[PDB]
Design an enzyme around this catalytic site. Structure first.
Site, mmCIF file in Angstrom:
data_model
loop_
_atom_site.group_PDB
_atom_site.id
_atom_site.type_symbol
_atom_site.label_atom_id
_atom_site.label_comp_id
_atom_site.label_asym_id
_atom_site.label_seq_id
_atom_site.Cartn_x
_atom_site.Cartn_y
_atom_site.Cartn_z
ATOM 1 N N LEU A 1 0.855 -1.185 0.000
ATOM 2 C CA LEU A 1 0.000 0.000 0.000
ATOM 3 C C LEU A 1 0.897 1.242 0.000
ATOM 4 O O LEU A 1 0.663 2.182 -0.752
ATOM 5 C CB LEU A 1 -0.936 -0.002 1.223
ATOM 6 C CG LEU A 1 -2.000 -1.096 1.179
ATOM 7 C CD1 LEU A 1 -2.713 -1.227 2.490
ATOM 8 C CD2 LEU A 1 -2.963 -0.892 -0.016
ATOM 9 N N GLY A 2 1.938 1.208 0.816
ATOM 10 C CA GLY A 2 2.891 2.291 0.898
ATOM 11 C C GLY A 2 4.126 1.913 1.679
ATOM 12 O O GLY A 2 4.089 1.071 2.570
ATOM 13 N N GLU B 1 9.729 6.162 5.156
ATOM 14 C CA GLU B 1 10.452 6.150 6.432
ATOM 15 C C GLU B 1 9.687 5.349 7.484
ATOM 16 O O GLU B 1 10.295 4.717 8.356
ATOM 17 C CB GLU B 1 10.583 7.585 6.956
ATOM 18 N N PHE B 2 8.348 5.420 7.420
ATOM 19 C CA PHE B 2 7.420 4.817 8.370
ATOM 20 C C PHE B 2 7.507 3.308 8.516
ATOM 21 O O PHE B 2 7.150 2.763 9.554
ATOM 22 C CB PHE B 2 5.989 5.214 8.006
ATOM 23 C CG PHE B 2 5.537 4.927 6.591
ATOM 24 C CD1 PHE B 2 4.915 3.727 6.275
ATOM 25 C CD2 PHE B 2 5.610 5.907 5.611
ATOM 26 C CE1 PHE B 2 4.416 3.500 5.003
ATOM 27 C CE2 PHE B 2 5.112 5.674 4.332
ATOM 28 C CZ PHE B 2 4.510 4.479 4.043
ATOM 29 N N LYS C 1 6.689 -0.329 6.150
ATOM 30 C CA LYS C 1 6.072 -0.871 4.958
ATOM 31 C C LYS C 1 4.668 -1.357 5.329
ATOM 32 O O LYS C 1 4.493 -2.042 6.326
ATOM 33 C CB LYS C 1 6.944 -2.007 4.418
ATOM 34 C CG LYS C 1 6.348 -2.706 3.231
ATOM 35 C CD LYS C 1 7.301 -3.755 2.732
ATOM 36 C CE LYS C 1 6.763 -4.457 1.525
ATOM 37 N NZ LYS C 1 7.603 -5.637 1.190
ATOM 38 N N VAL C 2 3.678 -0.945 4.562
ATOM 39 C CA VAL C 2 2.301 -1.310 4.800
ATOM 40 C C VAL C 2 1.772 -2.065 3.620
ATOM 41 O O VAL C 2 1.913 -1.612 2.498
ATOM 42 C CB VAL C 2 1.416 -0.100 5.190
ATOM 43 C CG1 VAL C 2 -0.049 -0.509 5.337
ATOM 44 C CG2 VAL C 2 1.923 0.517 6.484
ATOM 45 N N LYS D 1 1.458 -3.699 8.940
ATOM 46 C CA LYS D 1 2.644 -2.857 8.994
ATOM 47 C C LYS D 1 3.827 -3.700 9.469
ATOM 48 O O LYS D 1 3.697 -4.542 10.357
ATOM 49 C CB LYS D 1 2.439 -1.643 9.908
ATOM 50 C CG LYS D 1 3.584 -0.634 9.865
ATOM 51 C CD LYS D 1 3.084 0.747 10.262
ATOM 52 C CE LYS D 1 4.176 1.699 10.670
ATOM 53 N NZ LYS D 1 3.605 3.015 11.038
ATOM 54 N N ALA E 1 -7.816 0.920 5.527
ATOM 55 C CA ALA E 1 -8.411 2.186 5.102
ATOM 56 C C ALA E 1 -8.104 2.304 3.605
ATOM 57 O O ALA E 1 -7.004 2.692 3.204
ATOM 58 C CB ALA E 1 -7.801 3.346 5.878
ATOM 59 N N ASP F 1 1.756 14.189 16.403
ATOM 60 C CA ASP F 1 1.914 14.232 14.964
ATOM 61 C C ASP F 1 0.580 14.291 14.197
ATOM 62 O O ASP F 1 0.462 13.679 13.139
ATOM 63 C CB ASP F 1 2.800 13.081 14.474
ATOM 64 C CG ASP F 1 2.242 11.694 14.737
ATOM 65 O OD1 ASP F 1 1.098 11.596 15.234
ATOM 66 O OD2 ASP F 1 2.946 10.697 14.426
ATOM 67 N N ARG G 1 -1.279 13.980 6.473
ATOM 68 C CA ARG G 1 -0.435 12.847 6.052
ATOM 69 C C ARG G 1 -0.599 11.644 6.998
ATOM 70 O O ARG G 1 -0.303 10.518 6.612
ATOM 71 C CB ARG G 1 1.067 13.233 6.099
ATOM 72 C CG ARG G 1 1.622 13.808 4.800
ATOM 73 C CD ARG G 1 3.015 14.432 4.998
ATOM 74 N NE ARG G 1 3.485 15.102 3.773
ATOM 75 C CZ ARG G 1 3.271 16.389 3.494
ATOM 76 N NH1 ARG G 1 2.638 17.169 4.362
ATOM 77 N NH2 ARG G 1 3.703 16.906 2.358
ATOM 78 N N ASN G 2 -0.940 11.916 8.262
ATOM 79 C CA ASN G 2 -1.032 10.973 9.363
ATOM 80 C C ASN G 2 -2.469 10.607 9.762
ATOM 81 O O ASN G 2 -2.715 10.175 10.878
ATOM 82 C CB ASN G 2 -0.255 11.537 10.543
ATOM 83 C CG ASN G 2 1.206 11.760 10.203
ATOM 84 O OD1 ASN G 2 1.789 11.087 9.366
ATOM 85 N ND2 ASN G 2 1.827 12.724 10.823
ATOM 86 N N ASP H 1 -0.856 6.609 12.932
ATOM 87 C CA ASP H 1 0.535 6.938 13.241
ATOM 88 C C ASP H 1 0.762 7.302 14.709
ATOM 89 O O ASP H 1 1.129 8.426 15.038
ATOM 90 C CB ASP H 1 1.045 8.022 12.281
ATOM 91 C CG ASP H 1 0.929 7.620 10.811
ATOM 92 O OD1 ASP H 1 -0.162 7.745 10.246
ATOM 93 O OD2 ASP H 1 1.920 7.192 10.241
HETATM 94 C C1 LIG Z 1 -2.589 4.996 -1.567
HETATM 95 O O1 LIG Z 1 -1.708 4.628 -0.491
HETATM 96 C C2 LIG Z 1 -2.171 3.977 0.675
HETATM 97 C C3 LIG Z 1 -3.361 3.219 0.696
HETATM 98 C C4 LIG Z 1 -3.783 2.606 1.877
HETATM 99 C C5 LIG Z 1 -3.013 2.715 3.054
HETATM 100 C C6 LIG Z 1 -3.444 2.077 4.361
HETATM 101 C C7 LIG Z 1 -4.657 1.280 4.546
HETATM 102 N N1 LIG Z 1 -4.706 0.976 5.770
HETATM 103 N N2 LIG Z 1 -3.623 1.434 6.437
HETATM 104 C C8 LIG Z 1 -3.258 1.224 7.685
HETATM 105 N N3 LIG Z 1 -4.043 0.486 8.435
HETATM 106 C C9 LIG Z 1 -2.082 1.738 8.127
HETATM 107 C C10 LIG Z 1 -1.614 1.469 9.545
HETATM 108 C C11 LIG Z 1 -1.972 2.318 10.582
HETATM 109 C C12 LIG Z 1 -1.563 2.087 11.903
HETATM 110 C C13 LIG Z 1 -0.803 0.968 12.204
HETATM 111 C C14 LIG Z 1 -0.446 0.094 11.167
HETATM 112 C C15 LIG Z 1 -0.858 0.337 9.848
HETATM 113 C C16 LIG Z 1 -1.245 2.596 7.225
HETATM 114 N N4 LIG Z 1 -0.177 3.184 7.690
HETATM 115 C C17 LIG Z 1 0.401 4.423 7.170
HETATM 116 C C18 LIG Z 1 -0.501 5.640 7.488
HETATM 117 C C19 LIG Z 1 0.158 6.900 6.872
HETATM 118 N N5 LIG Z 1 1.523 7.133 7.443
HETATM 119 C C20 LIG Z 1 2.159 8.385 6.981
HETATM 120 C C21 LIG Z 1 2.461 5.973 7.371
HETATM 121 C C22 LIG Z 1 1.819 4.625 7.806
HETATM 122 N N6 LIG Z 1 -1.658 2.717 6.025
HETATM 123 C C23 LIG Z 1 -2.871 2.084 5.578
HETATM 124 C C24 LIG Z 1 -1.844 3.469 3.023
HETATM 125 C C25 LIG Z 1 -1.401 4.088 1.852
HETATM 126 O O2 LIG Z 1 -0.185 4.803 1.850
HETATM 127 C C26 LIG Z 1 0.872 4.571 2.822
#
Ligand SMILES: COc1ccc(-c2cnn3c(N)c(-c4ccccc4)c(NC4CCN(C)CC4)nc23)cc1OC
Ligand SMILES: [Cl-]
Ligand SMILES: [Cl-]
Length: 283
Positions: free
Chosen positions: A24-25, A28-29, A31-32, A52, A101, A145, A149-150, A163
């Protein structure tokens, strides 16, 4: 040893029940990735989730932030806060299984809509976030934070504050705490955080003010081209961001109240939620 992870039976999930999918992304955070989890939290079928994990070139501080986000998530539960479902902490990489999400971050969601969004949609997004913040403040948490973005946008365009790795308690519970200095974006920091390193629920209100500006400008960039030194001097001498186009006077007034020099002169999240709810129902 900070690498040793003590297992929490309440949150442990079988690795073999989790199907890792597309990324998904990654930044620095960490890998999701998108995933399917079978027999999660007692239910009979499968659930689409996000996982994550650390990046390949992860450092000890990234593991420390991942473990810290995991321990904060275990304590909270709210419709506008990203929900933890479980974790795979033993015999392999640490994996956090969390609510999916589908729209990604609020910043990207708003930028992509430059998708039709009305002012009502924008006020509703701000209101959903304020309810989450209000619940987090009663849980004695300081987010630090809060920014577009968060924040995540889930099914039905529902806001999920995310975040939690930089989150702190309002009263420090540990006898010894090693603070990771200067980790919050300068442009989202309250004046007292910039000068004295002070982070309270009232500095989260100042960040909510910046977030309001981001929502109203559909993912705009605050203080364009202003370096940290000039930004700090301008905030010290009472200068604030001007009213952006496509922002009501009442909404800009709420932003100014969030950016008041004196923390106790800013509104509390319970007041902000009622302010935003009235703005929603007026239409
Ligand atoms: C188009 O791109 C994207 C589409 C979907 C997502 C997505 C869907 N669900 N979900 C989560 N549950 C977590 C998450 C949150 C808390 C703990 C563990 C994981 C997460 N974490 C990031 C939140 C932003 N920050 C900035 C970094 C972590 N991202 C996403 C993310 C995307 O881009 C990074
Ligand atoms: Cl939807
Ligand atoms: Cl803490």
């Amino acid at each position: 040893d900070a690498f040793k992870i003590l297992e929490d039976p309440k949150w442990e999930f079988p690795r073999k029940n989790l199907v890792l999918g597309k990324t998904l992304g990654e930044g620095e955070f960490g890998k999701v990735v998108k995933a399917t989890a079978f027999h999660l939290k007692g239910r009979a079928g499968y659930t689409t989730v996000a996982v994550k994990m650390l990046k390949e070139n992860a450092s000890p501080s990234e593991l420390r932030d991942l473990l810290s986000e995991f321990n904060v998530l275990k304590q909270v539960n709210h419709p506008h806060v990203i929900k933890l479902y479980g974790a795979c902490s033993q015999d392999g990489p640490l994996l956090l299984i969390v609510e999916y999400a589908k729209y990604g971050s609020l910043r990207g969601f708003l930028r992509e809509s430059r998708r039709a969004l009305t002012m009502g949609d924008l006020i509703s997004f701000a209101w959903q976030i304020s309810q989450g913040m209000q619940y987090l403040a009663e849980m004695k948490l300081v987010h630090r934070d809060l920014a577009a973005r968060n924040i995540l946008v889930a099914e039905g365009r529902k806001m999920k504050i995310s975040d939690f790795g930089l989150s702190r308690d309002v009263y420090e519970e540990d006898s010894y705490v090693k603070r990771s200095q200067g980790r919050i974006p300068v442009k989202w920091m309250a004046i007292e955080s910039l000068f004295d390193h002070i982070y309270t629920t009232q500095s989260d209100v100042w960040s909510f003010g910046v977030l309001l500006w981001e929502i109203v400008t559909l993912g705009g960039n605050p203080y364009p081209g202003i370096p940290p030194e000039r930004l700090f001097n301008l905030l010290k001498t009472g200068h604030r961001m001007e009213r952006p186009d496509n922002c009501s006077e009442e909404m800009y007034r709420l932003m100014l109240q969030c950016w008041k020099q004196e923390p106790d002169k800013r509104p509390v999240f319970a007041d902000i939620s009622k302010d935003l709810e009235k703005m929603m129902v007026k239409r």
